[PDB]
Amino acid sequence: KKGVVHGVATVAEKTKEQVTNVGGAVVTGVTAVAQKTVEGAGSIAAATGFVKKDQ
Amino acid sequence: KKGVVHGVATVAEKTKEQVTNVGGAVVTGVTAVAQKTVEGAGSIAAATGFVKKDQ
Amino acid sequence: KKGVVHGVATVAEKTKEQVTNVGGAVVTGVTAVAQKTVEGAGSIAAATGFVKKDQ
Amino acid sequence: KKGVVHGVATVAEKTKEQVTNVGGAVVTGVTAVAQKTVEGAGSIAAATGFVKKDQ
Amino acid sequence: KKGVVHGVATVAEKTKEQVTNVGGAVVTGVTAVAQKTVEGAGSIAAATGFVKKDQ
Amino acid sequence: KKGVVHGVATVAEKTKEQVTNVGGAVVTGVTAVAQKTVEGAGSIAAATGFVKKDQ
């Protein structure tokens, strides 16, 4: 076989899960957050997949 | 076989899970956060996959 | 076989899990955080995969 | 002070939390379950407070 | 002071948490279960407070 | 002071936590279980407070 990509690719066979991202956010997984009190200014209290930027 | 990529690629066969990211965030995994009190200014209380930038 | 990449690639066969990242964050694994009190300014209380930058 | 109980009592002062049970079940706490696949016959997959009886 | 109990009592002062149980189950605490696959017949996969009886 | 109990009592002053149990199960503490695969018939894979009986 032959393949040429520029990116971002994701090429496969017999594949149970696939995610391609440029971004941005993708949430495909099981996630449970139980929480009782959030205070403070400002605290990231429960982050799973996270980025921050400033310019 | 033959392959030429520029990136970012992810090329495979018979593959159960795949993630390609440029970004950005991707959450595909099981995650449980149980939490009772978050205070303070400002504290990253429970971070799983995390980045920070400032300019 | 033949392959030429610029990066970042991830090339394989018969492969159960794959992650490619430029970023950014990717969370694909099982993660359990149980927590009772977070205070202080500012304390990274439970970080699994983490980066920090400042300019 | 004076107190006479038959049970089950729970007597206090200045008290943040209280539970009295005869039973039975009481759930008052933070709880997060994230789960992806349960099989088998029959498996108690994630039990926090649990009892079993048979006669 | 004076106290006479038959049981089950729980008598106190200045007390942050209290549980009285005859039973039965009481869950008051922070609990996080993250789980990906449960199989088998039959396996108690993640038990925190647990009893079993048979007659 | 004077006290007479039959049991089960738990008598105190200035006390941060209290548990009385006849049972039965009580879960009041922080607990995190992260788990990826459970198999077999039948294996107690992660037990914190546990009993078993048979007659």
Numbering used by the authors:
A (entry chain D), B (entry chain B), C (entry chain F), D (entry chain C), E (entry chain A), F (entry chain E): 45 to 99
Mind quoting what the paper says about this structure?
Accumulating evidence shows that α-syn amyloid fibrils serve as prion-like seeds for the propagation and cell-to-cell transmission of the pathological entity of α-syn. Several single point mutations and genomic duplication or triplication of SNCA, the gene encoding α-syn, have been identified to be causative to the familial forms of the diseases with a broad spectrum of distinctive clinical symptoms. α-Syn hereditary mutation E46K was originally identified from a Spanish family with autosomal dominant parkinsonism.
In this work, we determine the cryo-EM structure of the N-terminally acetylated E46K α-syn (Ac-E46K) fibril at an overall resolution of 3.37 Å. The density map showed a right-handed helix with a width of ~10 nm and a half helical pitch of ~68 nm, which is consistent with the AFM measurement. The fibril contains two protofilaments that intertwine along an approximate 2-fold screw axis. The high quality cryo-EM density map allowed us to unambiguously build an atomic structure model for the Ac-E46K fibril. In contrast, in the Ac-E46K fibril, the E46K mutation breaks the salt bridge of E46-K80, which results in the breaking of the other two essential electrostatic interactions (K58-E61 and K45-H50-E57).
